[PDB]
Design a protein around this nucleic acid. Sequence first.
DNA 1: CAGTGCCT
DNA 2: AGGCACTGGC
Lengths: 678, 105
Amino acid sequence: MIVSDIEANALLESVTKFHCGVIYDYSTAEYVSYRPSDFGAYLDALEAEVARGGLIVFHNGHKYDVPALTKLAKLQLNREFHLPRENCIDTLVLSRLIHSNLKDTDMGLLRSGKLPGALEAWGYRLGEMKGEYKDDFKRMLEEQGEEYVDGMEWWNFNEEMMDYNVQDVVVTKALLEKLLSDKHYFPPEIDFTDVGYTTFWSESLEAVDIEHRAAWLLAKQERNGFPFDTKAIEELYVELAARRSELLRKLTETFGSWYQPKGGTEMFCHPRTGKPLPKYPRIKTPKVGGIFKKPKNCELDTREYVAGAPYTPVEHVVFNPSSRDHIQKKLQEAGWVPTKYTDKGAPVVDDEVLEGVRVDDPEKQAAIDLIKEYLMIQKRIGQSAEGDKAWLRYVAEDGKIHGSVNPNGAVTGRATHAFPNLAQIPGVRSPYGEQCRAAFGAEHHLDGITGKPWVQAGIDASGLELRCLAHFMARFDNGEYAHEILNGDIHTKNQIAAELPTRDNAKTFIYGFLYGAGDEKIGQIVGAGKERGKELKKKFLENTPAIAALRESIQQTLVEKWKRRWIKGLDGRKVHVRSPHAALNTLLQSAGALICKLWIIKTEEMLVEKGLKHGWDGDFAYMAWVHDEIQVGCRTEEIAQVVIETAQEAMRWVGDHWNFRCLLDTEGKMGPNWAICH
Amino acid sequence: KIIHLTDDSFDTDVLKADGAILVDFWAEWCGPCKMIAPILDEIADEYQGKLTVAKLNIDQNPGTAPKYGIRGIPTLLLFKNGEVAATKVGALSKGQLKEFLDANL
DNA sequence: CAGTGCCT
DNA sequence: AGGCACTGGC
Ligand SMILES: [Mg+2]
């Protein structure tokens, strides 16, 4: 086993030069540095470890170092270099698994200050190295009277860079040993820094292997990117911008502008008692000016101020439909009486309350709908074009949006998506969802050889949450619930268990139950509120004792205040439990998450074993994984058919693999884009 | 004796009026405005026949102030034949107002 | 940073 | 429930 790290001239997307690399070998206990001209030797050293059936540890190597080495080897040496997945370990991937209860700066992309909770020390140092190296580079520069430029610290190799590279390997080595010292994931009897790759994966908790396969495949997914119709979105942007203007014109006509105090420095005090009046707006008292200009032997002072004569400076403000404050201000002046405020005094002004607002003036009452449409349109404009993470700002030269994915960013094992978040694209059911969705699709990618558009295969795990629920209650009801889902009508049954009217109510209740939801939204289906809500969620449980037994068994295991603050996941990992009441949900969300993770892994593996190639230069390409669904680009219709059938096969395999008490299934759909494939 | 203006009556009461008109742009939430208010009452009783004092509350009539670039209140505009002759901002004392008036009148 | 909304 | 991120306002 060896531990390594490299320094290059840019992010994966545009890297062209290998600056240096360092290698620590456990079999020799020595650190070896490789400078710019030792690149070939560095690569030879990595392949030598592969030839021995060894292991290579990088911190974040799955997303950067490894693909970067493949790229740089070809560019700089015209050499084919591909480290096999099974020979690579990633301490970032391991940390996110073992310290899943903690956040991280995602290697410097997020500012520490904003992250809640604490941060593992070694992982923190590794993620701040670029910024630290940068700060030191500038220091030395602005120390020799030399101007600093954007990011020149990465342009050329230098010893300061070599020293940081060496330090990265010492820290990575320490993180590794720290991670391997966790007996839950790594049996104590085995020295994991002294075993071959097959032993490493086979003797450690299944979760270790799964997270590494997930990171490897998702790294490939990011590189593939999601074909995006830039033109279609620019046109939608023009359309939305026009509706925004028109709604602004109309709202500015309805709610005129006004004045507000601003820039007051001195406190206002009663002229009589001199008593400070804090509630009164701040004033300003000029120390110069009079009715007549200063004499010299008297001409009028043109100025507008008079020493000692105080005034309240003010600003002119125009109604802004995006301001919750303006809306609150204008609506109450229309007779609206806020029924619910925030824990800061401000009255709640969300779509639901605006929906309830009733004012006498008919034009103002109608303006509310214009305000609701305005806020929604701003939400779309922000996500598609104007926001910091807007689609139009992220589409790349290859015509694709390469969204980032943290394979295990959520406590439950779910992945997190960002830059931009492709797991929060408006659905087809919401306003403009059809156009937003249609903009992401295989059809927007033209085959490199034939120029023909690709086809998309969209596949999702059918009623995954309910099935996970069925599985866990099987030890209390013997598969009754699982049997009803597969043959009967679990929804109707739930409609009977819970004395609810329509069958859809239950179909909305259950998901509210699984995905957590107060008695408010709960009873909000039965007209009432959290009132009948409490009654409803109780009558349900009453008629479905297996769920009550389950909840109780979870409690007994965690609360004796805690006996253990974690729950065991499907692959054996520890799943931190934030609160006792959210325990069942954490369990269900985690099973779905882990089932979906192994599923997409097994699907890709089966495709490759069937001879299909993963890549735009191949037969298929993973474009997105949104929790319980995957969108895959396919070179042909026939291939899309194979991907769909293979995904179904993989899901069955996963269900059998973890002896699931409820049969698992998938539904697939073929089409040109995300709108049609869901 | 003070003329209380509105956005819609401004043009005829002020701009098309004959004689000197002192307009006070004010708001109920301004301390200084409340300070000069009494002063204006006494000024209206004194300058009758030479000048008319008028008030425009900027919250009830928001269209006029903007046109004159008001940045502080209370703002006093002395109009003569449809145009601003002089302008002072701040709670002037009774004494300071008389000088302002006498000098510009 | 507060208040909200989009997704599974 | 778990996430990301936009806009307003200090
Ligand atoms: Mg590195």
